[PDB]
Ligand binder design. Sequence first.
Ligand SMILES: [Cl-]
Lengths: 121, 121, 121
Amino acid sequence: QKKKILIVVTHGPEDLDRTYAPLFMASISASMEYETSVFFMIKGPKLLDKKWQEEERKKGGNPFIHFFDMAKENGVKMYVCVQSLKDMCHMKEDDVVEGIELVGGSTLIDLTLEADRTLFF
Amino acid sequence: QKKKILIVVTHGPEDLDRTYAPLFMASISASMEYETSVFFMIKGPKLLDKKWQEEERKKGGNPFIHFFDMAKENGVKMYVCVQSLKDMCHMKEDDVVEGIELVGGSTLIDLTLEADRTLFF
Amino acid sequence: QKKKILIVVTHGPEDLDRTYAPLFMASISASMEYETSVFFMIKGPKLLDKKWQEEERKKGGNPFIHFFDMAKENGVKMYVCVQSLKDMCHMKEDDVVEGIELVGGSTLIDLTLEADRTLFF
Ligand SMILES: [Cl-]
């Protein structure tokens, strides 16, 4: 049975330095053939804003965008906490980039129980 | 056998945004019938100060207070690291709101080993 | 079989308050006869800079240095993420204090899987 790694991202662009590592780690994990998921919450959802990502892609040089894309290429599954998205980040569900599963906080409990190990950032 | 969830809170009012989520998560966990505990340390103990909580209750509108109370209503067990309380936060043991167990740091090691999963904030 | 505790340190001197606890925790864990390791990453590697540590030892009074030394006396194994060291912290490998194992990020995945429990700071 394949082992499962969950990575929790709780910072946004206000602290970008804390957002690179987790996504690079997600690619590393995936490359080692672990089924790897990332869960965005608290300010994490701001990293998934369509307009912010488009801005950063156009500017270039954003390491979060680089590692986000690498994680996606490596098959990393991604989730965003809707209570964080709406109530903490003041985003709409439609503001989230495609391919991220919108879930409630209960899903974090399920995902951490289902994973072999969870990393918190 | 009932499963056990531990949530570690390491921020205080200096970063309130990082304190809501963990306590909301504790209520969610409890509502799913997991035995749920919260462990306050580093600046976390400041959230448990009697005078601060009374101030915030009187002002209203503090989401930490809301989620703290909900967690308590849902039977969430709470612990505070005495070394953090005294040496980091400069609080007295008597400054802690009632119903929180005052423990040493060794207890975090026991609690994380005894829990099925631990969440870190 | 002896149980294994891993502690992850992600802050540096920019947030010293978040660096004391983890190292004190590492000594506590070791004193309880758990095989204990600390993994430094993100800004954590700055805590391991030779010149910074020498400065702080000469000034005195730095609690991180105190708890770092206690952890070492208690046999705590230490690792530093080379991608963090170089790319986030702009340090050279030679800038790291002796006795820390320089490793890639894949090693965090191995270490967290091999440990019974992991603490994240
Ligand atoms: Cl922080």
